[PDB]
């Protein structure tokens, strides 16, 4: 019920017909949505004469009092949502010229007065929806030059008339909305008795190639830049369908979800420039070479779901003639997601110059392997980003990326990739920084792995089931510029010292869900394995759920920059003391669901210095004061964040405080 006293008055879901009268004056915004009220009391609003905003939603009010807005003219934005009123007079609006925005939502005004808005000319935006009209006469005279947006959505306006739109000849509407309005006919020249129309949007309106061809002629000599149309039932296109648009200069276009099938040649020769263009969700069976001739200035294109769904029973095979992209000399961004092209030809992309981003995820029904020249068509483009996931590839032949030198980000994960990595597949790669290869079947490793590309910076390998991983010569040896590396979930068993050496800028490591418990066991033949060396830049480390039960004290000696580390879900019970000494700045820790029993300050000497958060929500504690003394006392005296401190930090192990919060002790 209460209002946040922050120059606003929010009163929602309070369902009261009497406005509060205890409201301090100095607040200046109000809302009464989700409430029911009878009529506007001006007297109650008179005490507090500061309101830049007023909102009423889900409130049915039959009439408004004209005297309230003359009382309070510093009101600038007003909301009327879900109101019973459907016929209002300018009397209420007689002195309301100072508003700048008025919301008419779900108010079902079937008809308005003759000249209800002659008074006001300063407002910028006015929206109307859920309102049924068939005439758009709002004022006999030219007025309201200061309005930029008008919405007529959810309306039953049928025919537009030239005499109707003369009202804003003195004005220049930035954009008009006419969607969700069943409109059947347009009077000729209606769009001209008005100022410059910059943007027009038309969606879910049934036109067809013929009627569009008629209206296309109606659009000659206009300052239109943004045309939007979707779900317009345009199965095919002709050249004359876009003929009358030759007398204007469009900038943006959209043809999504129109279920288009076939485009004739040179249907787009009228547009030298189209920087952005969207074509998605269409049933296209064949593309012609000269269909897309004339589009020189293009920067962004998409074809997601914009082709025929492949059916061998139909044997449609949506095919693309090569050199069809020789007309696109400026394209920089392309989107070929999730289509069913049969395979990669040899000269799809001959001519492309400016390409920098390209996506081919789930784009081919069958791309089993990579060949010597499968990308020969991409010789003359400085691509930066490539996307080739969910493509059920099977194997890679070497010397396939010879053309690509400028690439810096590569994504090949989530496919069916099993082979041995010879290292010769990285021939042409020169500027690569990151490569994703997680979610594959298996790979066999060699020392001849990454000699060609020491310029890499990040490499993700998760759930890949690597082979030949414990080789004494580190296959990562040629790489030295690595920053973050991940090897989680691989359940690897044996590890050599030599993989972690010569690397200095490694920021974060992740090895969770693996089986490396034996290598740090005290009784291990050869003793504990100390692979942690040469790392002066590690800040975050993750070793969750690896079955650990013992930590040698000499592993964190090289770790001076570690900030966050996790060891939860392991099998740890008790740790040796004086092991966090080299850890100058640790900010967080996690040991929940371990078998830690006692808290002793000797092990937590450097640990409890200065932390931000620690979590051990479930552990078999012995809540007795021999060990819990510090921890109970430290909690009551410490500022470090400990979530669910009382919710999930009880003790059931000892009869003492059996099943009771340790903090209470």
């Amino acid at each position, epitope marked *: 019920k209460c209002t946040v006293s922050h120059e606003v008055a929010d009163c929602s879901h309070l369902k009261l017909t009497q406005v509060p009268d205890d409201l301090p004056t100095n607040i200046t915004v109000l809302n009464l949505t989700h409430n029911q009220l009878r009529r506007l009391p001006a007297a109650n609003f008179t005490r507090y004469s500061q309101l830049t905003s007023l909102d009423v939603g889900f409130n049915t009010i039959s009439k408004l009092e004209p005297e309230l807005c003359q009382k309070l003219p510093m009101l600038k934005v007003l909301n009327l949502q879900h109101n019973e009123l459907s016929q209002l007079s300018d009397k209420t609006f007689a002195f309301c010229t100072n508003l700048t925005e008025l919301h008419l939502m779900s108010n079902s005004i079937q008809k308005i007065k003759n000249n209800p808005f002659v008074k006001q000319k300063n407002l910028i935006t006015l929206d109307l929806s859920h309102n049924g009209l068939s005439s758009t006469k709002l004022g006999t005279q030219v007025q309201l030059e200061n309005l930029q947006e008008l919405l007529l959505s959810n309306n039953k306006i049928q025919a537009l008339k030239s005499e109707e739109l003369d009202i804003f000849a003195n004005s220049s509407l930035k954009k008009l909305e006419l969607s969700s309005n069943q409109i059947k006919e347009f009077s000729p020249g209606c769009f001209h008795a008005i100022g410059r129309l910059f943007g027009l949007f038309l969606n879910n309106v049934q036109l067809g190639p013929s009627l569009t061809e008629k209206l296309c002629l109606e659009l000659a000599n206009t300052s239109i830049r943004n045309l939007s149309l979707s779900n317009s039932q345009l199965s095919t296109t002709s050249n004359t369908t876009f003929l009358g648009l030759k007398w204007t200069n469009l900038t943006m276009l959209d043809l999504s979800y129109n279920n288009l099938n076939v485009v004739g040649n040179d249907s787009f020769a009228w547009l030298p420039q189209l920087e952005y263009f969207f074509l998605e969700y269409n049933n296209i069976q064949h593309l012609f070479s000269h269909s897309l001739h004339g589009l020189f200035n293009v920067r962004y294109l998409n074809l997601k779901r914009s082709f025929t769904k492949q059916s061998i029973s139909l044997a449609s095979l949506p095919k693309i003639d090569d050199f069809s992209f020789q007309w696109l000399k400026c394209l920089e961004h392309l989107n070929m997601e999730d289509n069913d092209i049969p395979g990669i030809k040899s000269n799809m992309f001959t001519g492309l110059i400016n390409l920098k981003y390209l996506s081919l995820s789930n784009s081919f029904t069958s791309l089993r392997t990579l060949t010597n020249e499968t990308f020969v068509s991409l010789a003359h483009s400085p691509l930066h980003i490539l996307n080739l996931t969910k493509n059920k590839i099977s194997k890679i032949e070497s010397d396939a990326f010879s053309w690509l030198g400028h690439l810096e980000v590569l994504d090949l994960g989530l496919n069916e990739i099993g082979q041995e990595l010879t290292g010769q597949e990285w021939r042409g790669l020169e500027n690569i920084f990151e490569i994703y290869l997680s979610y594959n079947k298996y790979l066999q490793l060699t020392r001849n792995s990454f000699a060609l590309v020491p310029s890499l910076q990040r490499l993700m390998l998760r*759930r890949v089931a690597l082979k030949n991983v414990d080789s004494s010569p580190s296959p990562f040896q040629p790489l030295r510029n690595l920053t973050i590396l991940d090897l989680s*979930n691989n*359940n690897i*068993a044996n590890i050599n010292d030599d993989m972690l050496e010569g690397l200095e800028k490694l920021e974060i490591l992740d090895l969770q*869900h693996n*089986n490396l418990a*034996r290598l740090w066991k005290h009784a291990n033949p050869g003793g504990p394995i100390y692979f942690l060396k040469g790392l002066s830049h590690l800040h975050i480390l993750n070793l969750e759920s690896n079955g650990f039960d013992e930590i040698p004290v000499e592993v964190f000696k090289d770790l001076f920059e570690l900030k966050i580390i996790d060891l939860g879900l392991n099998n740890l019970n008790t740790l040796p003391a004086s092991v966090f000494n080299n850890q100058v700045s640790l900010k967080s820790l996690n040991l929940q669901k371990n078998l830690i029993t006692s808290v002793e300050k000797k092990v937590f000497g450097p640990a409890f210095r200065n932390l931000t958060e620690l979590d051990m929500r479930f552990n078999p504690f012995d809540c007795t004061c021999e060990s819990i003394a510090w921890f109970v006392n430290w909690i009551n005296e410490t500022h470090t964040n400990i979530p669910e401190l009382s919710s999930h930090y009880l003790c059931n192990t000892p009869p003492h405080y059996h099943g009771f919060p340790v903090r209470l002790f």
Partner: antibody
Amino acid sequence: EVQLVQSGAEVKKPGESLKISCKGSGYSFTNYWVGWVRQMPGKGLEWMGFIDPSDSYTNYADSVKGRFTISADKSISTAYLQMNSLTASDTAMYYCARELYQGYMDTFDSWGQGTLVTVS
Amino acid sequence: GSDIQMTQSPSSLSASVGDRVTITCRASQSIGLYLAWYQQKPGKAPKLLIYAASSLQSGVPSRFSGSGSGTDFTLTISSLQPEDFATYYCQQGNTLSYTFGQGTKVE
């Protein structure tokens, strides 16, 4: 066409080794991994590990840690599972399966007929 | 300890022929569309791969419906049949651990 045959049922003394042969036919057998699953009497089913016939490359579960060895011979196209030191509570049922990697998630398409071993 | 804990809630038994059954799923850690289903005949080892992934069907079986994502999942059979009376099992693949679930619904 795909088939798997295991060794016969068996009962013996605690403190022994034993070998089980898992043979299959209907495919190359040189390309797909083979793993072993154990089900205790009236219990759930649990994984131990798998081996690649191409090079006899192996991975064991956390519960194995020795005491069980997986092997195969290319010429016979048969898989061998042996427990080295056998004791009480090891009585259960045993099966062998072949991975298919249907879609992007590994799937065990075919399962062996079944082998029962009780230590009494 | 180091498993993705897997639990089957309904524990349903003795449904009449033609009924609709629902098998739900709960996991310690979120698995993304990495759930699989296995069915066991009471007198035989399973040999029954009904769901490769969530909402996936093998070549042989039919009329089984599965759904769910993230931590929870649902398994449904449109209408029970006289052959449709057997125990079920579920396994996780997010990690190579390949851990299965405890005994599922028995019909």
